[PDB]
Amino acid sequence: EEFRPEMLQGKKVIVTGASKGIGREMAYHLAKMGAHVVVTARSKETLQKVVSHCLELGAASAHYIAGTMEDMTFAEQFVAQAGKLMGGLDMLILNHITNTSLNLFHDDIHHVRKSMEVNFLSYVVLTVAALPMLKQSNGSIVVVSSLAGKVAYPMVAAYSASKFALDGFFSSIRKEYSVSRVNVSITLCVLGLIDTETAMKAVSGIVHMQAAPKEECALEIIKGGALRQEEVYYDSSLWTTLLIRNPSRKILEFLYSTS
Amino acid sequence: FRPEMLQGKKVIVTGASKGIGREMAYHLAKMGAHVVVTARSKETLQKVVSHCLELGAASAHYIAGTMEDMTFAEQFVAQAGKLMGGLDMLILNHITNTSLNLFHDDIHHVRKSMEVNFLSYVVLTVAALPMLKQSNGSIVVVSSLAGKVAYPMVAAYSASKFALDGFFSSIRKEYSVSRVNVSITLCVLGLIDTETAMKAVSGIVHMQAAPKEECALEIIKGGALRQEEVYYDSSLWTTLLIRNPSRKILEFLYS
Numbered sequence: 001e002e003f004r005p006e007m008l009q010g011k012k013v014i015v016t017g018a019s020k021g022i023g024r025e026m027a028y029h030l031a032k033m034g035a036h037v038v039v040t041a042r043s044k045e046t047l048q049k050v051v052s053h054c055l056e057l058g059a060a061s062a063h064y065i066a067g068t069m070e071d072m073t074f075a076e077q078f079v080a081q082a083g084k085l086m087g088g089l090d091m092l093i094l095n096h097i098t099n100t101s102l103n104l105f106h107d108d109i110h111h112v113r114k115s116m117e118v119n120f121l122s123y124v125v126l127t128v129a130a131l132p133m134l135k136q137s138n139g140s141i142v143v144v145s146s147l148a149g150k151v152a153y154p155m156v157a158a159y160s161a162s163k164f165a166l167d168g169f170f171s172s173i174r175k176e177y178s179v180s181r182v183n184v185s186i187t188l189c190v191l192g193l194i195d196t197e198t199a200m201k202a203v204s205g206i207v208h209m210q211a212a213p214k215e216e217c218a219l220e221i222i223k224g225g226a227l228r229q230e231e232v233y234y235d236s237s238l239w240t241t242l243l244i245r246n247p248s249r250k251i252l253e254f255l256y257s258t259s
Numbered sequence: 260f261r262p263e264m265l266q267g268k269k270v271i272v273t274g275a276s277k278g279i280g281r282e283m284a285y286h287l288a289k290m291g292a293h294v295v296v297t298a299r300s301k302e303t304l305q306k307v308v309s310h311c312l313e314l315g316a317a318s319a320h321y322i323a324g325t326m327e328d329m330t331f332a333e334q335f336v337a338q339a340g341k342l343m344g345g346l347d348m349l350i351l352n353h354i355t356n357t358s359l360n361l362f363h364d365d366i367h368h369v370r371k372s373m374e375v376n377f378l379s380y381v382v383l384t385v386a387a388l389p390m391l392k393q394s395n396g397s398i399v400v401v402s403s404l405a406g407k408v409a410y411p412m413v414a415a416y417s418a419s420k421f422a423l424d425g426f427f428s429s430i431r432k433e434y435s436v437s438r439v440n441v442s443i444t445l446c447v448l449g450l451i452d453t454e455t456a457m458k459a460v461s462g463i464v465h466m467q468a469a470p471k472e473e474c475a476l477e478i479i480k481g482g483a484l485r486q487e488e489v490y491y492d493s494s495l496w497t498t499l500l501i502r503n504p505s506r507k508i509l510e511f512l513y514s
């Protein structure tokens with residue numbers, strides 16, 4: 001069962017937070033791979049500029065729908081109109097995130113909430129919406145996450161708390177769907193340090209560490225989402241890909257799959 | 260662990276009207292400590308307070324109010340503190356009422372789980388810290404299996420629980436570096452006795468439940484012993500598997 005770029009040729013894929021960084025990269029790969037793609041963010045021409053670039057690369061469609069993921073209702077009707085546009089949904093790629101920097105937690109609950117709303121809560125809203133379509137297409141879901149979403153790490157509390165939330169939620173939903181005969185794929189991506197303009201500015205000269213390529217990360221998340229893989233791991237450290245895997249949990253879950 | 264640690268200690272106990280929250284209250288009382296329990300049901304908070312104000316507690320008060328309200332939680336530590344002239348232990352243990360069900364479109368419960376179960380815990384903490392730094396006190400977040408492993412029918416519940424982990428486990432690290440001598444103990448509990456759970460897993464889940472009594476105590480001990488985490492559950496398999504070695508190792512690698 002090998003991945004084929006040709007696999008994503010007629011698929012109507014949505015990609016959130018595709019204005020820049022990873023998001024944008026996934027947008028291009030999927031574009032060049034000739035497929036209907038809808039990018040969303042909060043940037044007039046920043047999007048207007050990637051849509052153009054997509055069509056050129058060899059898309060098959062390309063639009064955009066600006067709106068902050070803070071307004072749950074935007075995500076509400078976003079999926080709506082993004083669907084009343086491609087005609088159904090074949091693979092949602094939630095990936096957007098409220099911008100965050102490195103800081104020790106003090107009293108910024110507003111920012112704790114923002115994250116826990118944008119980074120997580122909106123991902124549910126987007127899913128609920130896209131589900132019907134997805135169920136009907138046997139779509140795949142891809143929730144981009146971080147190492148911080150698997151391991152405790154200082155200076156990124158509110159951030160990590162949200163990515164952890166996505167695991168606790170999507171992995172559980174995955175299980176319900178499993179037994180609920182629903183044939184909708186659900187991929188979770190734990191990413192290591194990626195060379196985005198965002199990270200390489202929010203951590204450069206601060207939280208010491210080396211990053212991995214951007215585009216190589218985007219397509220990887222893709223082969224993973226497409227192959228209906230459970231989770232995808234992508235980090236430039238061998239020994240990390242080695243440890244980040246927790247089989248104790250896999251077993252405990254299995255053992256508990258009979259109760 | 261010696262009970263001569265809790266005696267005369269100022270301890271808060273959210274979710275203390277019934278269930279594990281309540282029992283913890285009694286122990287803190289029999290152990291002659293100062294307690295301020297909360298929840299929503301005034302009537303119930305009355306009954307435990309006196310019961311506590313007779314089990315040996317050096318002081319026992321209650322303050323009803325919904326943790327869905329953020330300024331309430333915020334105003335809760337201030338009064339709870341003045342009531343006992345300072346704070347020693349903060350025990351977040353309250354959860355928004357739920358049940359077993361696949362997920363569908365009730366984001367209201369999804370949004371509320373992360374409000375009551377998670378967001379309020381940060382509120383309670385940020386406002387209780389000063390007094391906690393004021394006595395090298397502790398914090399005790401109560402989680403559960405679903406908070407370490409993914410389980411169906413509790414997606415919402417689990418999401419909030421994983422949040423607590425990512426957050427506090429992340430905060431604790433920031434702490435040991437910030438010269439913040441306040442401990443943070445995450446409790447990972449299996450199935451517990453309490454009716455407000457037992458009555459929800461009626462014929463749907465199979466596992467011999469552990470007793471509130473013991474579970475309640477164990478948690479307190481762990482917090483008193485400043486233990487990063489308390490693993491309590493009847494089943495033997497869990498206590499072993501539930502622990503995460505790779506995460507421990509993967510983490511020790513940054514520090």
Ligand SMILES: NC(=O)C1=CN([C@@H]2O[C@H](COP(=O)(O)OP(=O)(O)OC[C@H]3O[C@@H](n4cnc5c(N)ncnc54)[C@H](OP(=O)(O)O)[C@@H]3O)[C@@H](O)[C@H]2O)C=CC1
Nearest residue numbers: 017019020021022041042068069144146191194196198199
């Ligand atoms: N970069 C890294 O090192 C790592 C990244 N990750 C994961 O990668 C994914 C994306 O990160 P990355 O692409 O590098 O980061 P970027 O900051 O470069 O991209 C953020 C994207 O989010 C969009 N966005 C921000 N706020 C909102 C909002 N309110 N509504 C809609 N869109 C919004 C942005 O557009 P705009 O703000 O203009 O609306 C933009 O296109 C996340 O899921 C993240 O957790 C994980 C580990 C490491």
Ligand SMILES: NC(=O)C1=CN([C@@H]2O[C@H](COP(=O)(O)OP(=O)(O)OC[C@H]3O[C@@H](n4cnc5c(N)ncnc54)[C@H](OP(=O)(O)O)[C@@H]3O)[C@@H](O)[C@H]2O)C=CC1
Nearest residue numbers: 274275276277278298299300326352403450451453455456
């Ligand atoms: N019993 C079990 O098997 C398990 C329980 N746990 C953990 O133990 C803890 C609680 O124990 P549990 O046995 O479930 O206790 P209960 O189910 O009996 O309920 C605990 C409390 O929640 C309170 N509560 C509900 N809504 C609110 C609110 N908005 N604000 C304040 N309090 C509220 C209730 O009082 P009121 O409604 O009057 O406010 C009551 O005191 C939770 O953190 C749970 O996550 C973990 C694993 C298993």
Ligand SMILES: C[C@H](NC1=NC(=O)[C@](C)(C(C)(C)O)S1)c1ccc(F)cc1
Nearest residue numbers: 100101102146147148159192193199202
């Ligand atoms: C978006 C990016 N996500 C990351 N998540 C992680 O686990 C990495 C690899 C770390 C380095 C934090 O270990 S970086 C991020 C960058 C800065 C910030 F303040 C919060 C988050």
Ligand SMILES: C[C@H](NC1=NC(=O)[C@](C)(C(C)(C)O)S1)c1ccc(F)cc1
Nearest residue numbers: 357358359403404405413449450456459
């Ligand atoms: C609050 C209580 N916590 C539990 N936490 C878990 O992980 C247990 C042990 C499992 C699910 C695995 O049996 S039960 C709970 C009670 C009712 C409900 F509908 C969902 C959760």
